[PDB]
Amino acid sequence: KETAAAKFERQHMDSSTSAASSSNYCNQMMKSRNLTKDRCKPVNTFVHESLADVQAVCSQKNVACKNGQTNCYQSYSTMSITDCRETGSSKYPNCAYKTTQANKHIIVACEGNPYVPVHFDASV
Ligand SMILES: [Pt+2]
Numbered sequence: 001k002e003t004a005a006a007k008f009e010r011q012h013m014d015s016s017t018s019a020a021s022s023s024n025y026c027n028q029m030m031k032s033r034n035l036t037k038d039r040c041k042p043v044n045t046f047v048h049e050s051l052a053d054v055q056a057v058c059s060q061k062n063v064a065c066k067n068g069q070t071n072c073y074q075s076y077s078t079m080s081i082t083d084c085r086e087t088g089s090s091k092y093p094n095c096a097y098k099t100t101q102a103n104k105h106i107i108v109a110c111e112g113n114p115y116v117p118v119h120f121d122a123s124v
């Protein structure tokens with residue numbers, strides 16, 4: 001069974017390259033991370049920093065999470081991210097995404113030991 005920390009890395013970490021070039025990054029990435037298997041996951045963000053940099057967010061700016069828990073943290077620095085958002089015409093099993101590159105702060109929920117990200121809350 002996938003741990004919460006492992007799911008976070010599968011959904012949100014893309015440390016291999018510093019950006020999204022291809023307009024088909026999201027279609028490709030959403031597929032290879034298993035986020036088009038059963039349904040089209042509508043919105044998902046990928047972070048293009050090192051896992052060490054992202055795990056360090058858990059010792060940065062403590063903030064509330066969207067759900068009201070207080071184990072969220074905002075990255076002090078901006079980070080390279082890609083936003084994947086399903087198109088208006090996307091219908092499973094042919095999932096379609098627009099790919100948008102951005103440099104923004106991330107907000108993640110952290111938990112467990114080691115104390116690492118388990119949810120992507122938002123980018124700011
Ligand atoms: Pt800022």
Ligand SMILES: [Pt+2]
Binds near residue numbers: 118119
């Ligand atoms: Pt959770």
